[PDB]
Amino acid sequence: VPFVEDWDLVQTLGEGAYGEVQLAVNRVTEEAVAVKIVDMKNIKKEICINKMLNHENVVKFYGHRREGNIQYLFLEYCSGGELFDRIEPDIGMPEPDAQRFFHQLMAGVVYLHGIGITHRDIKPENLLLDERDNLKISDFGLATVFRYNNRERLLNKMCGTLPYVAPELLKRREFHAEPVDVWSCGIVLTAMLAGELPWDQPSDSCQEYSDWKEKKTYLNPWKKIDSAPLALLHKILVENPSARITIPDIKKDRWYNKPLKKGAPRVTS
Ligand SMILES: Nc1ncc(-c2cccc(O)c2)nc1-c1ccc(C(=O)O)cc1
């Protein structure tokens, strides 16, 4: 079939770093993909990690092409955009929506962790929605291997985004990868349910973080969160990463397992 490898770049989807993401549409088939354009003036590791990934709640990597110094990553197009834009400031979103997004986020993170990959920058800007509002973890530029040949490596590079980062990353030279991603998922849940972030960073000089440690959940954002999800947050947002709840136990949590949401036409007679 002639022309089937030709794609028109038709819309800017995002920028940041020294790159852009373009909506690309196939000339023949009209398939829409996202193309991440990175001018190499790191991306080899991101491509390598991307090639490992095959799960319904992770942005699919289709392949890559390089033309000189511009590298092209072909990725699953997510027409719903960022979870960030489903969060109403100071409100959040309906609790059943947040629970459903949280389920899909856990499935994605369970998958990455089982193949030994940590994302390291989980936040609503990096959680994309397809046309059916299915959540997809995106952007593996800060991602790394924390397990190989069944042997765990401790991390020591400070990275991520301060309001989402686990306190051990600010306090300790080395830390386990998995509790860090769990923590950031808890801050995402807090955001979805309160429409605000609890602190600038989880440090002993952050008053809002100190209030949480002192259990002042009569304050915001906690006062906006029902007691059931708040009880999950109490288990996730635990300062000691060894005492923090693990994903297997998140999946046994009462709120996590609470029926809340009807499924996604019909007629009467
Ligand atoms: N794969 C994607 N699909 C949709 C959108 C997007 C993001 C915001 C608004 C919008 O309408 C679309 N963004 C991407 C995307 C996001 C991040 C990456 C990445 O690997 O950095 C690659 C692609």
Residues 264 and 141 placed together within one structural domain of the fold? yes
Q: How many helices (H) and strands (E) does the chain have?
A: 7, 12
35 in ligand 1 pocket by Cβ < 6 Å?
no
Q: How many angstroms separate the CA atoms of 124 and 230, rounded?
A: 19
Residues 80 and 94 placed together within one structural domain of the fold? no
Look at residues 156, 163, 161 and name the one whose alpha carbon lies nearest to residue 141. Answer: 161
Q: How many angstroms separate the CA atoms of 145 and 94, rounded?
A: 35
Catalytic-role residue among 6, 85, 97, 121: 121
Report resolution (Å) to 1 decimal.
Answer: 2.2
Residues 11 and 43 placed together within one structural domain of the fold? yes
Residues 164 and 205 placed together within one structural domain of the fold? yes
| Length of the chain as a residue count | 269
23 and 10 in contact (C-beta within 8 Å)? yes
Protein residue with its CA nearest to atom 1 in ligand 1: 77
Rounded to the nearest 5°, which phi and psi values hold at 51? -65, -20
Amino acid at 167: P
For tokens 């288990």, the residue is 235
Residue 239 in tokens:
């300062």
Rounded to the nearest 5°, which phi and psi values hold at 76? -60, 120
Out of 88, 111, 137, pick the residue that ends a domain. 88
Residues 82 and 184 placed together within one structural domain of the fold? no
For tokens 């949401």, the residue is 261
Distances (CA, A) of 216 to 135, 209, 210, 236: 32, 10, 9, 16
Residues 112 and 182 placed together within one structural domain of the fold? yes
Residue 261 in tokens:
């949401």
CA 65–ligand 1 middle distance (angstroms): 18
Strand order in the sheet with 70-76: 7-15, 19-26, 32-39, 70-76, 61-67
120 and 160 in contact (C-beta within 8 Å)? yes
Site to probe by mutation for ligand 1, drawn from 10, 11, 12, 13 as the one with most ligand atoms within 8 Å of Cβ, is 13
Residues 199 and 179 placed together within one structural domain of the fold? yes
Residues 15 and 142 placed together within one structural domain of the fold? no
> What CATH number has the domain bearing residue 93?
1.10.510.10
Active-site residue, 121 included: yes
Q: Which residues of 84-107 are buried (b: 16+ CB within 10 A; e: fewer)?
A: eebbeeeebbebebbbbbbebbbb
Q: How many angstroms separate the CA atoms of 144 and 67, rounded?
A: 26
Strands (DSSP E) along the chain, which ranges? 7-15, 19-26, 32-39, 61-67, 70-76, 81-82, 117-118, 127-129, 135-137, 144-145, 147-148, 151-152
Residues 175 and 132 placed together within one structural domain of the fold? yes
Region of residue 206 (phi > 0: left; psi between -120 and 50: alpha; otherwise: beta): beta
Residues 126 and 205 placed together within one structural domain of the fold? yes
Residues 122 and 133 placed together within one structural domain of the fold? yes
Q: Count of domains in the chain?
A: 2
Protein residue with its CA nearest to atom 7 in ligand 1: 81
The DSSP code for 245 is P
Torsion angle of alpha carbons 250, 253, 256, 257, nearest 10°?
130
82 in ligand 1 pocket by Cβ < 6 Å?
yes
Experimental method: X-ray
Out of 30, 61, 88, pick the residue that ends a domain. 88
> What CATH number has the domain bearing residue 76?
3.30.200.20
What sign does the CA torsion over 63, 66, 69, 72 have? Answer: negative
The DSSP annotation for 143-168 comes to -EE-EETTEEPPB----S-GGGS-HH
Out of 88, 108, 129, pick the residue that ends a domain. 88
With a CB cutoff of 8 Å and minimum separation 6, the contacts of 19 are 36, 37, 38, 39
- Residues of the domain holding 241: 89-269
232 in ligand 1 pocket by Cβ < 6 Å?
no
165 and 201 in contact (C-beta within 8 Å)? yes
Where is 248: in which H helix or E strand?
helix 247-250
Residues 36 and 102 placed together within one structural domain of the fold? no
